[PDB]
């Protein structure tokens, strides 16, 4: 029933922010081939 985050485990990141008065939950994203930045 208990499990932690180890080294070398595949994770995805998430956040919750309001927009248009609606809690738009998102995930971090990035495509480092032509743009080294990050998007959601």
């Amino acid at each position: 029933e208990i499990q932690f985050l180890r080294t070398d485990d595949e994770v995805v990141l998430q956040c919750t922010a309001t927009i248009h008065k609606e809690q738009q939950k998102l995930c971090l994203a990035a495509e480092g081939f032509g743009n080294r930045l990050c998007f959601l």
Binding site: F4, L5, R6, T7, V12, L13, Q14, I19, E31
Partner: protein, 136 residues
């Protein structure tokens, strides 16, 4: 290294974008001026010792340092060099991740693990090429 060691709050963390091996880490990112004083630490493979690490801090006062990070725990991230948190700004009527002193909550989730290995078995997200047994 250690090998499947656990994860503690406050310890230095290293990330990696999976298919594009660009180690998101402490880089001299001074390009984003949506907030006009804020960084956007993005993707580049420069794992260089001190300028290699973000750091965890807990979301709120329920789990102190030295405790093991558990699934579902929302967290707070920060560089060591710039010491900006992982900010979720709003540049122009839209979302813009930046790095600032206004922190942001950043929830993690499970996808798989080392024990969750294929060895030929199917795993979600994996590409493939379909085949007919007769017609190929």
């Amino acid at each position: 290294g250690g090998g499947h060691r656990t994860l503690l709050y406050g310890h230095a963390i290293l990330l990696r974008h999976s298919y594009s091996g660009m180690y998101l880490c402490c880089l001299s990112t001074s390009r984003s001026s949506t907030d006009k004083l804020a960084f956007d630490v993005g993707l580049q493979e420069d794992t260089t010792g001190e300028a290699c690490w973000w750091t965890i801090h807990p979301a709120s006062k329920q789990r102190s340092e030295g405790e093991k990070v558990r699934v579902g725990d929302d967290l707070i991230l920060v560089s060591v060099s710039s010491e900006r948190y992982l900010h979720l700004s709003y540049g122009n009527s839209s979302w813009h991740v930046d790095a600032a002193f206004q922190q942001t909550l950043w929830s993690v989730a499970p996808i798989s693990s080392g024990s969750e290995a294929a060895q030929g078995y199917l795993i979600g997200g994996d590409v493939l090429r379909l085949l007919h047994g007769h017609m190929d």
